[PDB]
């Protein structure tokens, strides 16, 4: 069932119990669980807060923790399969799954019982009704309704995609409670923008949500401050800023942001031999000196700073980049920190995305989820720098596929693959900078590319997992368009393909666009997926 | 306005000639045109290539080849080697106003181009050099022997009274003697002087020492 | 050859140049020089060069904005070349020091 309110038949529900969180390892995810923790320490609730990141850590933690929680609040997870199925409970537990992935399965939308979703009923979804669901001329109307019931599944279940943030939905729940705090409304604006990084959510959506938060931002700001009088330069201030959409370029040098920012990178073709030239035609339109831009950007001459971004706009728009400016938020405490929503996504995710081999993934969990606060503001400034390698990483992984030629046409959609050993496929490696290498990528070929029949292809990108289990993991990615729903059918495709194969697929992570393949399996399987395609 | 001529005919020297208002505003427009006008033998446009690729590197420098500029203005190849600093003044000028309308912001990178001549046909041997050849561009070869650093000197000097605050209004620094106030407009102390090391403009100097190639006629 | 292996080794192409009889290729080797001193009075190719000035250009441009990156070049396949190369070089005259020798095929490869 959906919660249609979540103070009274969720928050109160759970105040007066034990509760455990398990949370996604994704930085939306990271900032609902802050909003939470919060509100839970606000009002002494005994919390218990485990990470996943796949389905089988997700059921080997709930089959250690059944017994002594009853309240289960899974956040960016669960909502896409049916949870009694994949976690068998008892039938006095409650799960409360606080999730962002679309389709919502219909056994846990239409289970009134156990299965609780805290997802607002105003976003954009469309279950079928009960009637066409669940249950001679007599056997004949039957058959002829599951033939119905099939048809119409599919085309529900077919496109996977995204809807309203988790911590959007619980800095709701929080706001309705009356204890929204001012890092409660930061976090909330990160973890929008963690959607909006990672493209999971249209532009269009992104600016209405952003206009959501911008009354939110107004009130806290005029909660205790006007033009008159002021706050202390202690406090933190969010702003809204109509800012610029390179990467990390407050830290940086504003000639390493325009190298390894995705969207400049494609439009010059920084990889290439004469992608350089081509930066150094647009700084020379700028008029910027190049001492100055190969400056860091805190030591950049306040005169070039004064109105960067008007130039930078005015000229973008003349070499054809024409949304250069992006609605965003930044936050300033402090006399020396500043940071925007961005910034702060990359930190985190460069945090909980780290190539070190150190402890475990849920150690770099931790690591991301404390850079959140700003109590641990030193953990934040190394992930940006964790950021910075990332992000170079990324650029000369996406240089060596293009002039290599690895990304390659296969008929409906274009391949790729990481060979072993090759430099930095350890950081991608992990499925999520997986994905997210994978979408840079498959930009700067639709850039760079001349055919144009070949830049309305998705991509397929796979890379090494395991060597000892032989494995690989493998992506999927819809058609990179101005005008792009973020709707992708990979998910269904690559479960059909498998199975059309009898592929040994294991289905661990939460985006069903993300699989693990044993290795030689890949050929009937990609040879499927072609004849699925079509 | 003062109104364009035929150039090649004048009764002063060549020296006092483009020293002239008249001729100077000629020879500016003169080169602003073949700038913005001179074509490869292919038909690309050189010039706004060879702008655009100084633009980009910040390079603050013009290169410009006497073998066409022949060909385009004839006039102008007469008299750069006969005064040669007057029109190189001059062609900087004009570079530089060409410049800032390529790319209207470059006066933020530099405030002056220099305009430099290349394959000038009337090279010399280094000990062939003559009176003859006196306050004339020539082009010459040789080994370089001897560098002093790259030192500041001054160009464009301010100096501070040497009783009171007034800075007295700047002294275009010769390569002959250091050019001096002898005494300030404001109070007629004179003498000594402290220059405003902060106001005043420097350049970069080097003097090299060339001598010739020990294998071109140097036989013993 | 009269030179030591510490400076043998640091050369990464070693080249021999015999003029050993053979009357064909005398006819052809003496029928060049001909024609080249004819050629250039003051007045084994089958390809035909570039002109001097596009290879000076060539190779000034290919020195500067080409840097080839090394990220595969069949590890096992040139270690086992060089193992046994230093095997037949224990037997006889020439001299692959260890790494040198490895490091010169990386670098001609580049
Ligand atoms: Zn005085």
Redesign the interface.
Same mark, same amino acid.
């Given at each position: 069932m959906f919660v249609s309110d979540f103070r009274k038949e969720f928050y109160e529900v759970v105040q007066s119990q034990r509760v455990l969180l398990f949370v996604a390892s994704d930085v939306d995810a990271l900032c609902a669980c802050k909003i939470l923790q919060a509100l839970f320490q606000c009002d002494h609730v005994q919390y218990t807060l485990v990470p996943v990141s796949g389905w089988q850590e997700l059921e080997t933690a709930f089959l250690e923790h059944k017994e002594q929680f009853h309240y289960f609040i899974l956040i960016n997870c669960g909502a896409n399969v049916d949870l009694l199925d994949i976690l068998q409970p008892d039938e006095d537990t409650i799960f409360f799954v606080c999730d962002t992935h679309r389709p919502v399965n219909v056994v846990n939308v239409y289970n009134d019982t156990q299965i609780k979703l805290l997802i607002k009923q105003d976003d954009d979804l469309e279950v079928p009704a009960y009637e066409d669901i669940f249950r001679t001329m007599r056997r004949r109307q039957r058959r002829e309704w599951e033939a119905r019931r099939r048809d119409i599944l599919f085309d529900y279940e077919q496109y996977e995609y995204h809807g309203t943030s988790s911590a959007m939905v619980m800095f709701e729940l929080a706001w309705m409670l009356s204890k929204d705090l001012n890092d409660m409304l930061w976090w909330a604006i990160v973890g929008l923008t963690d959607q909006w990084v990672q493209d999971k959510i249209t532009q269009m959506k992104y600016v209405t949500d952003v206009g959501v938060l911008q009354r939110h931002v107004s009130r806290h700001n005029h909660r205790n401050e006007d033009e008159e009088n002021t706050l202390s330069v202690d406090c933190t201030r969010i702003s809204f800023e109509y800012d610029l959409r390179l990467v990390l370029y407050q830290h940086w040098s504003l000639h390493d942001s325009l190298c390894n920012t995705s969207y400049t990178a494609a439009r010059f073709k920084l990889w290439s031999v004469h992608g350089q030239?081509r930066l150094?035609?647009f700084?020379?339109?700028?008029?910027?000196?190049?001492?100055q831009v190969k400056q860091k950007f805190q030591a950049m001459d306040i005169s070039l700073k004064e109105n960067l971004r008007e130039m930078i706009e005015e000229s973008a728009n003349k070499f054809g980049m024409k949304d250069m400016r992006v609605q965003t938020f930044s936050i300033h405490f402090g006399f020396k920190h500043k940071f925007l929503a961005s910034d702060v996504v990359f930190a985190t995710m460069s945090l909980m995305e780290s190539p070190e081999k150190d402890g475990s993934g849920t150690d770099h969990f931790i690591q991301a989820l404390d850079s959140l606060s700003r109590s641990n503001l030193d953990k934040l400034y190394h992930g940006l720098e964790l950021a910075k390698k990332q992000l170079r990483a990324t650029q000369q992984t996406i240089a060596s596929c293009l002039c290599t030629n690895l990304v390659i046409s296969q008929g409906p959609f274009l391949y790729c693959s990481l060979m072993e050993g090759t430099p930095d496929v350890m950081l991608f490696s992990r499925p999520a900078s997986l994905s997210l290498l994978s979408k840079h990528l498959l930009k700067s070929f639709v850039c760079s590319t001349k055919n144009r029949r070949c830049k309305l292809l998705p991509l397929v990108m796979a890379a090494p997992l395991s060597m000892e289990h032989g494995t690989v993991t493998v992506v999927g990615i819809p058609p990179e368009t101005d005008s792009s729903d973020r709707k992708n059918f990979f998910g269904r495709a690559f479960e059909k393909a498998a199975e059309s194969t009898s592929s040994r697929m294991l289905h661990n992570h939460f985006d069903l666009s993300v699989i693990e393949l044993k290795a030689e399996d890949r050929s009937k399987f990609l040879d499927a997926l072609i004849s699925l395609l079509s | 306005e003062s109104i364009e001529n035929l150039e090649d005919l004048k009764g002063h020297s060549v020296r006092e000639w483009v020293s002239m208002a008249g001729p100077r505003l000629e020879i500016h427009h003169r080169f602003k045109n073949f700038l913005r006008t001179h074509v490869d033998s292919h038909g690309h446009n050189v010039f706004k290539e060879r702008i655009?690729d100084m633009? =980009?590197?910040?390079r603050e420098s013009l290169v410009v080849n006497y073998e066409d500029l022949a060909a385009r203005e004839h006039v102008l190849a007469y008299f750069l080697p006969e005064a040669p600093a007057e029109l190189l003044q001059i062609f900087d000028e004009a570079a530089l106003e060409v410049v800032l309308a390529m *790319?209207? =912001? *470059?006066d933020?990178?530099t405030n002056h181009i220099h305009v430099r001549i290349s394959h000038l046909p009337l090279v010399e041997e280094l000990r062939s050099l003559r009176q003859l050849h006196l306050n004339q561009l020539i082009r010459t070869s040789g080994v370089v022997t001897s560098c002093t650093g790259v030192l500041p000197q001054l160009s464009m000097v301010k100096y501070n009274c040497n009783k009171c605050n007034f800075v007295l209004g700047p002294f275009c620094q010769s390569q002959n003697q250091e050019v001096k106030p002898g005494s300030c407009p404001e109070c007629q102390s004179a003498g000594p002087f402290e220059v405003n090391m902060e106001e005043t403009i420097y350049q970069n100097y080097q003097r090299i020492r060339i001598q010739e190639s020990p294998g071109k006629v140097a036989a013993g | 050859v009269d030179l030591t292996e510490p400076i043998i080794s640091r050369f990464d192409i070693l080249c021999v140049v015999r003029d050993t009889v053979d009357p064909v290729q005398d006819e052809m080797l003496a029928r060049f020089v001909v024609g080249s001193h004819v050629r250039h009075h003051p007045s084994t190719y089958g390809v035909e060069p570039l002109p001097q000035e596009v290879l000076k250009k060539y190779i000034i441009y290919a020195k500067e904005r080409v840097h080839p990156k090394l990220n595969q070049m069949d590890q096992d396949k040139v270690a086992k070349m060089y193992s046994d190369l230093r095997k037949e070089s224990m037997a006889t005259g020439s001299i692959p020091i260890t790494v040198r020798h490895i490091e010169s095929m990386i670098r001609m490869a580049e």
């Open positions: 030239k150094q035609e700084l020379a339109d700028m008029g910027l000196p190049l001492k | 655009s633009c =980009k590197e910040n *790319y209207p =912001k *470059y933020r990178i | -």
